[PDB]
Amino acid sequence: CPLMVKVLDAVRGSPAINVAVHVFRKAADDTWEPFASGKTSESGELHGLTTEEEFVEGIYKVEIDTKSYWKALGIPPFHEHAPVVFTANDSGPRRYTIAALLSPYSYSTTAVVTN
Amino acid sequence: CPLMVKVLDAVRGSPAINVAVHVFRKAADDTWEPFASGKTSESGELHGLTTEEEFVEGIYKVEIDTKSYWKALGIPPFHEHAPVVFTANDSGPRRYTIAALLSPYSYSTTAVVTN
Amino acid sequence: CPLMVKVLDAVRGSPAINVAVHVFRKAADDTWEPFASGKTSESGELHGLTTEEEFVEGIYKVEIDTKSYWKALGIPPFHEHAPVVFTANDSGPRRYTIAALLSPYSYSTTAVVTN
Amino acid sequence: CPLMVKVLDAVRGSPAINVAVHVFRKAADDTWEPFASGKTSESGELHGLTTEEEFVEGIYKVEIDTKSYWKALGIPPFHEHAPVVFTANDSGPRRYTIAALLSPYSYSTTAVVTN
Ligand code: NA
Ligand code: NA
Ligand code: NA
Ligand code: NA
Numbered sequence: 351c352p353l354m355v356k357v358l359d360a361v362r363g364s365p366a367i368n369v370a371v372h373v374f375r376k377a378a379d380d381t382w383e384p385f386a387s388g389k390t391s392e393s394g395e396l397h398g399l400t401t402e403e404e405f406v407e408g409i410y411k412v413e414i415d416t417k418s419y420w421k422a423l424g425i426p427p428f429h430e431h432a433p434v435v436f437t438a439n440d441s442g443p444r445r446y447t448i449a450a451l452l453s454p455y456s457y458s459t460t461a462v463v464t465n
Numbered sequence: 466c467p468l469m470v471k472v473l474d475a476v477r478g479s480p481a482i483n484v485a486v487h488v489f490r491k492a493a494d495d496t497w498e499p500f501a502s503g504k505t506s507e508s509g510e511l512h513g514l515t516t517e518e519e520f521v522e523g524i525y526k527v528e529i530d531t532k533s534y535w536k537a538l539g540i541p542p543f544h545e546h547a548p549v550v551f552t553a554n555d556s557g558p559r560r561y562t563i564a565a566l567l568s569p570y571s572y573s574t575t576a577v578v579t580n
Numbered sequence: 581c582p583l584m585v586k587v588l589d590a591v592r593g594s595p596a597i598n599v600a601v602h603v604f605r606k607a608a609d610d611t612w613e614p615f616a617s618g619k620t621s622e623s624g625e626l627h628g629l630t631t632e633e634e635f636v637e638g639i640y641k642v643e644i645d646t647k648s649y650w651k652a653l654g655i656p657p658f659h660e661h662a663p664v665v666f667t668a669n670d671s672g673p674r675r676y677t678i679a680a681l682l683s684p685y686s687y688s689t690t691a692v693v694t695n
Numbered sequence: 696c697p698l699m700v701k702v703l704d705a706v707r708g709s710p711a712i713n714v715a716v717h718v719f720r721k722a723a724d725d726t727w728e729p730f731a732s733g734k735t736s737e738s739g740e741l742h743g744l745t746t747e748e749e750f751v752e753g754i755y756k757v758e759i760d761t762k763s764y765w766k767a768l769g770i771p772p773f774h775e776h777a778p779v780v781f782t783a784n785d786s787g788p789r790r791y792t793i794a795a796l797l798s799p800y801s802y803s804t805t806a807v808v809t810n
Contacts, residue, residue, distance in 0.1 A: 358794070361476060363543055363570030363806045409660060428478055428666055428691045430639060435660040449703070451796075451805055453568045455478030456690035458803060460796055461658045461708045463685070473679075478693045524775060543806045545754060545780040551773055564588075566690055570808070573688060575681055575801035576773045578593045591706060593773055593800030658708055683798045685708030 352405045353386075353446050355396040355412060360453040361425065365394025368422070370415035373399060375408050382411055411435045412448045420454055428455040436461065467520045468501075468553075468561050470511040470527060475568045476540075480509025484534045488514060491524035500525065522554040527563045535569055543570040551576065582635045583616075583668075583676050585626040585642060590683045591655075595624025599649045603629060606639035615640065637669040642678045650684055658685040666691065697750045698731075698791050700741040700757060705798040706770065710739025713767070715760035718744060720753050727756055756780045757793045765799055773800040781806065 353373070357366035369390040374382035386399040412434040420427035434448050447462040468488070472481035484505040489497040501514040527549040535542035549563050562577040583603070587596035599620040604612040616629040642664040650657035664678050677692040698718070702711035714735040719727035731744040757779040765772035779793050792807040 358805055358807060360568035360571035360805055363808045365807065365809070425476075428693070430665040430667065433663045433665065435663065436658050437660065451571065451803065453475035453571070453690075455693070456475040456566060456568075456688065458573065458686065458688035458796065460683075460686035460703055460705055462703060462710065463658070463708045464710070473690060473692060475690060478691050480692065543781050543808070545782065548778045548780065550775040550778065552775065566688075568805075571803065571805035573681075573801065573803035575588060575590060575798075576593050577588060577595065578773070578800070590798035590801040591770075681801060683705035683801075686705035686796065686798070688803065 351397055351399075351445065352402050353399050353412075354448070355390065355399070355414070356447060356449045357390050357394045357396075357414060358449075358451045359394075359419075360451050360456075362423075365392065366390060366419055366450075366452055367392055367394060369394075369419045371396050371399075372413045372415070374411040374413070376410070385410065405438065407438050407440055409435065409437050414450055414452075416452055416457065419452065425454055429457070432457050432459065434459050434461075466512055466560070467517050467558060468514050468527075469563070470505065470514070470529070471562060471564045472505050472509045472511075472529060472534075473564075473566045474509075475566050475571075480507065481505060481534055481565075481567055482507055482509060483537070484509075484511075485530040486511050486514075487528045487530070489526040489528070491526075497526055517558060520554065520558070522552075524550065524552050526550045529565050529567075531567055531572065534567070540569050544572065547572050547574065549574050549576075581627055581675070582632050582673060583629050583642075584678070585620065585629070585644070586677060586679045587620050587624045587626075587644060587649075588679075588681045589624075590681050590686075595622065596620060596649055596680075596682055597622055597624060598652070599624075599626075600645040601626050601629075602643045602645070604641040604643070606641075612641055632673060635669065635673070637667075639665065639667050641665045644680050644682075646682055646687065649682070655684050659687065662687050662689065664689050664691075696742055696744075696790065697747050698744050698757075699793070700735065700744070700759070701792060701794045702735050702739045702741075702759060703794075703796045704739075704764075705796050705801075707768075710737065711735060711764055711795075711797055712737055712739060714739075714741075714764045716741050716744075717758045717760070719756040719758070721755070730755065750783065752783050752785055754780065754782050759795055759797075761797055761802065764797065770799055774802070777802050777804065779804050779806075
């Protein structure tokens, strides 16, 4: 599991469940190409997006579909989604967790990179 | 104005208006002594808490009364208040802005310190 | 001034000065079209991006160039930039402040929308 | 495990390891009484603070010793610590996670309350 996503809801104080997440990788023509996707579980986590073999160095975008999450709860949202864009760099063994904390008009994201 | 407080609401995307703020300073007997207090304005800001003369070196606690704010909006919040504790003026006077962003089950705070 | 951007630095406790910001608007062909850009001032603020006349309804992306900011401080950051994507002026004109707080491996963003 | 604490470091992009955490419970005389304490593990988590039997309804303060954490890394910090104050309410089965994300001049905290 070299790439995991964890999402929390700051309004309800809970994991953000059933949040769609789309991962893209920047192609040679400078466009974003679909790479992996899924929905967060009951724990707010999304595991199994990719494998060590497929997840090569490159520029990636992890897009968290925050607007659809808030709409499913009936809460007015501001953002369309929360894109998290970064370079994956092989610097010894690494696992990347993209964590996000969501509110209707605000969010935070952190990368947790461990060996 | 050596100490300012600014509060935003992450649910409504607005300044957090009429938020009570109590400032304490740690006394020689290690207890918290009342220092200054006030309420945020229509802009979510609280100016004029203290003066350069009164704001001496010390350990301060800026307590943002988040529970009363959320209850006045009819939303039950998780926290009792948001205390922000720091040492001030240790290397001479500085201007401190304590900013906070609120949600019912979460908050963030940052300090902007200028010379 | 219907669109303002404010950026703070969470490591130094200061405004994030000279941060490049690029604003795009989604065109009819679903591509991102350049709309406005600028750099934050000594206060960490970017004013005068657009006018009430030019800032029509649409989907906008406010891309904060966090990587160049951290690299100019000699700190390698995790993200390429911090894109903030939202629909604007859907229920008539509003004043939007996009605020962001930066750390090398994390950032937070909030929107303050006023009428 | 009815009360857990999880702490992340936004500068290094890692779990915040070996962070001291002190939990207090408000006594009848309105003072804070020590209740439980520990240090976050290699995963940034602190498990086993209390038991279902001891963790009754009441007002609690979870104080994260952020200044000692940053000092151990040699990074200049602003806050003395990050106190998180809340009422524990029995409203069916509940587990409380106090999560925090730390930067030298800023932090965020969220409560994740699950059944
Ligand atoms: Na994976
Ligand atoms: Na003042
Ligand atoms: Na403008
Ligand atoms: Na426990």
